[PDB]
């Protein structure tokens, strides 16, 4: 029987967003040094994803 | 789909209201969505039950209520003399909805009309009570006993020696239930 494509989409959208949030955890433990310049870059990275 | 004659006064629905015609403030409407207020109310009703007395009965120390008309396991009764009330009319055998009663009778040594066989298949019986409504001498009854699960179903073929033993055992309670319900019978 054909399998439903939504199973693939669940894993894929997780896989990408989960990689995306992972890339933000370093920001939350480096905020004081990053300051305004780091915030702006992270805002740009948050905006794209 | 509606009856003949004029259609019911205002049977037809009003025209549907558009979203912006609805009477519900955005503040009330948006708050009920995000705060989940109707689900909060239902969770609160379970807190109300939490602090109310439970309904539970501790069985077998506390029993549930049973009426004088209760239909439990069969018994064959006697008179105050000690003679069996049963005279083998076979009315309870004719009316049995499930053919659970088998009776064989003849003339006793003293010339009295009495049963020689009295079997009740407790696995055919539906506990309707018909057998005891049809008796002309109150000979067959159904005691309030509901606690007699057995191990083998051979134990559920009551013969006349067991049904008389049951009546001897249960007579005070049988006489009491008959005393309560006789006016209505």
């Amino acid at each position: 029987s054909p399998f439903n494509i939504s199973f693939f989409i669940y894993g894929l959208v997780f896989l990408l967003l989960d990689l995306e949030i992972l890339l933000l955890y370093p920001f939350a433990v480096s905020e004081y040094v990053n300051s305004a310049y780091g915030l702006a870059a992270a805002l740009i990275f948050i905006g794209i994803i | 789909a509606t009856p003949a004659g004029p259609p019911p006064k205002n049977f037809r629905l009003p025209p549907p209201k558009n979203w912006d015609e609805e009477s519900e403030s955005t503040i009330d409407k948006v708050g009920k969505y995000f705060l989940m207020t109707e689900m909060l109310r239902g969770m609160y009703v379970l807190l109300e039950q939490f602090f109310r007395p439970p309904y539970t009965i501790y069985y077998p120390f506390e029993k549930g209520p049973i009426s004088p008309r209760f239909r439990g396991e069969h018994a064959l009764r006697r008179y105050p003399s000690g003679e069996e009330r049963c005279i083998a009319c076979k009315l309870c055998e004719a009316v049995c909805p499930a053919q659970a009663i088998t009776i064989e009778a003849e003339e006793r040594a003293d010339g009295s009309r009495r049963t020689t066989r009295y079997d009740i298949d407790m696995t055919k019986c539906i506990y309707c009570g018909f057998c005891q409504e049809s008796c002309p001498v109150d000979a067959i009854v159904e005691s309030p006993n509901a606690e007699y699960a057995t191990e083998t179903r051979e134990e559920l073929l009551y013969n006349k020696e067991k049904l008389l033993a049951n009546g001897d055992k249960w007579e005070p309670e049988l006489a009491a239930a008959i005393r309560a319900d006789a006016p209505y019978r």
Binding site: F3, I5 | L157
Partner: protein
């Protein structure tokens, strides 16, 4: 087959030949009914309207036997092979008594001597105490009073004591039995680490438990079987390795064969049996059983004398081994070009769900 049976003692039975609610009028006592053979003799009598007294040791084990009979037909009695009263009162009403009781191993409570001798003694003495009509003793193939095998020895000595006190004993010497819930095909089917000391080179004549169960019925129904010995066995000579490859040819199983020499295997066999509480399938006497081959008694009656045909085990392996056949979509063969084309008329993904 007849409607009238005059028992060996002289009383007549008037049977009505039907099914569960019928009147077989035979009263039977089967000793050893909770094993693999006894459920076939019990079911055959009960499903034709006969009372079967089933003495039992464990309550849980006996339960499957009651389904075969109507109310008042399967009677269960709590018995012990060392309590004579339990044996006495199990056979006081019986017309035929069977004795199927037997182990293949010694226990902490029974030596092959205790089971096959001290039980047959204790039981046949009750058969003689109440003038029971037919007494049928199931012995073993290769039973012989002077044998290096305690199983062939002690089971051969029981045959002596059976007719010393009850001269009208049927003896039944079945070959290793096979079928559903056996220790022959299911052993080759189930075990993985297998120990032998004779290269699985046993040769014998495997017989279906179901004809053995049917044959034991007919020894009851023919009065001429009383007082003689039977040799029930199948139609073809077989070796264990030839039997195993049949199991192999059906189920596709890989098993470990260790085949440790007799000197280093038997002393070890006793130890495992003495400390493990379940039937481990190898014990000291069981290994010695491996070296013998079945020898058919030429003076003993066979299936044919009972109007029966044995079946071989090759016609039955697919039936009794089909449950043990791991077959998923993985193990299927590589596909052909014709069916590969058929797949192009289907979509194998649902892109909107």
């Amino acid at each position: 087959i007849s409607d009238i049976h005059i028992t060996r003692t002289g009383k007549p039975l008037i049977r009505i030949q039907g099914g569960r609610s019928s009147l077989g009028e035979h009263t039977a006592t089967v000793f050893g009914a909770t094993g693999q053979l006894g459920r076939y003799i019990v079911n055959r009598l009960a499903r034709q309207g006969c009372t079967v007294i089933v003495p039992y040791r464990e309550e849980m084990a006996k339960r499957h036997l009651k389904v075969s009979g109507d109310l008042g037909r399967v009677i269960f009695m709590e018995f012990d092979l060392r309590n004579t009263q339990s044996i006495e009162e199990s056979v006081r009403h019986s017309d035929v008594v069977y004795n199927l009781i037997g182990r293949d191993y010694p226990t902490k409570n029974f030596s092959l001597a205790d089971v096959h001798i001290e039980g047959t003694e204790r039981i046949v003495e009750a058969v003689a105490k109440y003038d029971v009509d037919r007494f049928i003793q199931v012995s073993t193939y290769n039973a012989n009073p002077d044998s290096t095998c305690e199983f062939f020895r002690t089971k051969g000595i029981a045959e002596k004591v059976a007719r010393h006190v009850f001269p009208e004993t049927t003896i039944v010497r079945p070959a290793p039995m096979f079928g559903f819930e056996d220790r022959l095909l299911l052993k080759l089917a189930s075990v993985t680490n297998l120990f032998t000391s004779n290269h699985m080179r046993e040769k014998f004549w495997p017989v279906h438990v179901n004809e053995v169960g049917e044959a034991l019925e007919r020894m009851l129904y023919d009065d001429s079987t009383a007082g003689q010995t039977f040799e029930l066995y199948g139609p073809r000579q077989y070796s264990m390795a030839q039997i195993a490859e049949l199991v192999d040819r059906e189920i596709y199983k890989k098993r470990r064969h260790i085949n440790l020499p007799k000197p280093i295997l038997q002393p070890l066999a006793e130890l495992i049996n003495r400390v493990l509480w379940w039937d481990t399938g190898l014990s000291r006497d069981q290994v010695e059983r491996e070296f013998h081959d079945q020898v058919i008694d030429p003076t003993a009656k066979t299936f044919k004398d009972l109007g029966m045909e044995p079946t071989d085990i090759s016609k039955w392996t697919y039936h009794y081994l089909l449950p043990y056949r791991p077959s998923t979509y993985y193990d299927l063969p590589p596909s052909t070009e014709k069916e590969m084309r058929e797949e192009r008329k289907y979509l194998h993904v649902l892109d909107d769900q």
